[PDB]
Copies of this chain bind each other. A is one copy, B any other.
Amino acid sequence: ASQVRQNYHEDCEASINKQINMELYASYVYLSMAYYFERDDVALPGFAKFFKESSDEEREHAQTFMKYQNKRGGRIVLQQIAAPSMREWGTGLEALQAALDLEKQVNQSLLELHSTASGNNDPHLTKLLEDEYLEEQVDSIKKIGDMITKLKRHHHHHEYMFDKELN
């Protein structure tokens, strides 16, 4: 194996490559959303900017894991990247609900990666997860939750005024 590899379990090496794929798929979804709210019959620039930023940060997530793979001497495996779930994301409100669920789904995967890393006594990897993914996951889920509470109060008039505060 690699000259730098030390205390690096192959089960961890492999969940990193599975997680990179999930980070990228999450990137693709926020990209689909981002430009959907830019359609002439949707015209929500606030929501569109928020989901463009989400897709960039999901891209950054994936890069930080590929950098990590190489740091420990593992070898990236990247699969295909599935097409997003849906493609018509409905209201801004249904988009945020979709995103809330996708961000909880990623946190479940990151809490699993953490347990797999604790179970192999990889305290470097648990440090990575705590300091760069667990805290970003909890803050974002709270961010989105806050937004869905503001935006559940029906009219299209309300979405548009909420949108402007996003922008």
Contacts and interface: CB of A to CB of B under 8 A. Distances in A.
Contacts of A115: 121
A144 B82 CA distance: 31
A78 B71 contact: no
A165 interface: yes
Given A40-B2, A157-B153, A87 B78 contact: yes
Nearest to A81: B81
Contacts of A3: 40-41, 100, 145, 148
A57 interface: no
A81 B126 contact: no
A94 interface: no
Contacts of A43: 145-147, 149-150
Interface of A: 2-4, 6-7, 28, 31-32, 35-36, 38-43, 63, 66-67, 69-73, 75-84, 87, 100, 104, 107-108, 111, 114-115, 118, 121, 123-124, 126-127, 129-131, 134-135, 138-139, 141-142, 144-150, 153, 155-162, 164-165
25 contacts: A2-B145, A3-B148, A4-B100, A4-B145, A7-B107, A36-B76, A40-B70, A40-B146, A42-B149, A71-B138, A72-B138, A75-B87, A78-B83, A79-B83, A80-B83, A115-B121, A118-B123, A123-B126, A123-B129, A124-B130, A124-B134, A127-B135, A153-B160, A157-B158, A161-B161
